[PDB]
A paper describes a structure:
A conserved feature of Polyomavirus T-antigens is a phenylalanine situated at the C-termini of their origin-binding domains (OBDs). T-ag is the only virally encoded protein needed for replication; therefore, it has been the target of numerous studies designed to understand its multiple roles during the duplication of the viral genome. One of the interesting findings of the JCV T-ag OBD structure was the presence of a C-terminal "pocket". This structure also revealed that the pocket serves as the binding site for T-ag residues from the A1/B2 loops situated on a neighboring OBD subunit. The initial function of the A1 and B2 loops is site-specific DNA binding to the viral origin.
JCV T-ag containing the [name] mutation, which is located in the C-terminus of the OBD, was unable to support T-ag dependent JCV DNA replication. The [name] JCV T-ag OBD crystallized in the I41 space group, diffracted to 2.7 Å and contained one molecule in the asymmetric unit cell. As with the wt JCV OBD, the topology of the OBD [name] mutant is a five-stranded antiparallel B-sheet sandwiched, on either side, by two helices. The A1 loop is the "DNA free" or "apo-conformation" (; reviewed in). Inspection of Fig 4B establishes that the previously described C-terminal pocket is also a feature of the JCV T-ag OBD [name] mutant. The crystallography experiments establish that the overall structures of the apo forms of the wt and [name] JCV T-ag OBDs are quite similar and that the structural consequences of the [name] mutation appear to be localized to the pocket. For example, the H-bond formed between N259 and R155 is lost and many non-bonded interactions made between the C-terminus and the A1 and B2 motifs are altered. Moreover, L258 causes disruptions to many of the non-bonded interactions and the L258 mutation also causes the loss (e.g., N259-R155) and acquisition (e.g., D257-F152) of several hydrogen bonds. That the changes are localized to the pocket, and not transmitted to other regions of the JCV T-ag OBD, is supported by the observation that the [name] mutation has little to no impact on A1 and B2 loop dependent site-specific binding to duplex DNA.
Author numbering: 133 to 259
Write the structure that this text describes.
């Protein structure tokens, strides 16, 4: 009932709303439970050989942010993520603003719980 219908409003700027689009992208964000995000963190690594992935706390919920070496459809990533939820909510969107989205997720009200590279992203890695 009180499950979020979208990402927090302060992150909407960094996100594509075209969840059914045909355009393949390489930057993704997932909003779900801490339970489901803890699971997807590793499963996405082995599914999409992600170049970077980071997990970010927000109250009880989590935001996963990841980059893939090949482009994918957002609907494809979401479909995979939806398999590993059942009754848990899950919001999956393409990220149009990679290092800035990430930096918002590294500051209040968010916090980085874990990430696949020590020190996380450097802005020069994306540029």
């Amino acid at each position: 009932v009180e499950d979020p219908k979208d990402f927090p409003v302060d992150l909407h700027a960094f996100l594509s709303q075209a969840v059914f689009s045909n355009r393949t992208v390489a930057s993704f964000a997932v909003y779900t439970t801490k339970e489901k995000a803890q699971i997807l963190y590793k499963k996405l690594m082995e599914k999409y050989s992600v170049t970077f992935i980071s997990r970010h706390g927000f109250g009880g919920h989590n935001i996963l942010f990841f980059l893939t070496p090949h482009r994918h459809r957002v609907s494809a990533i979401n479909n995979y993520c939806q398999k590993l939820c059942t009754f848990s909510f899950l919001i999956c969107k393409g990220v149009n603003k990679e290092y800035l989205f990430y930096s918002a997720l590294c500051r209040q009200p968010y916090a980085v719980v874990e990430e696949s590279i020590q020190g996380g992203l450097k802005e020069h890695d994306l540029n």
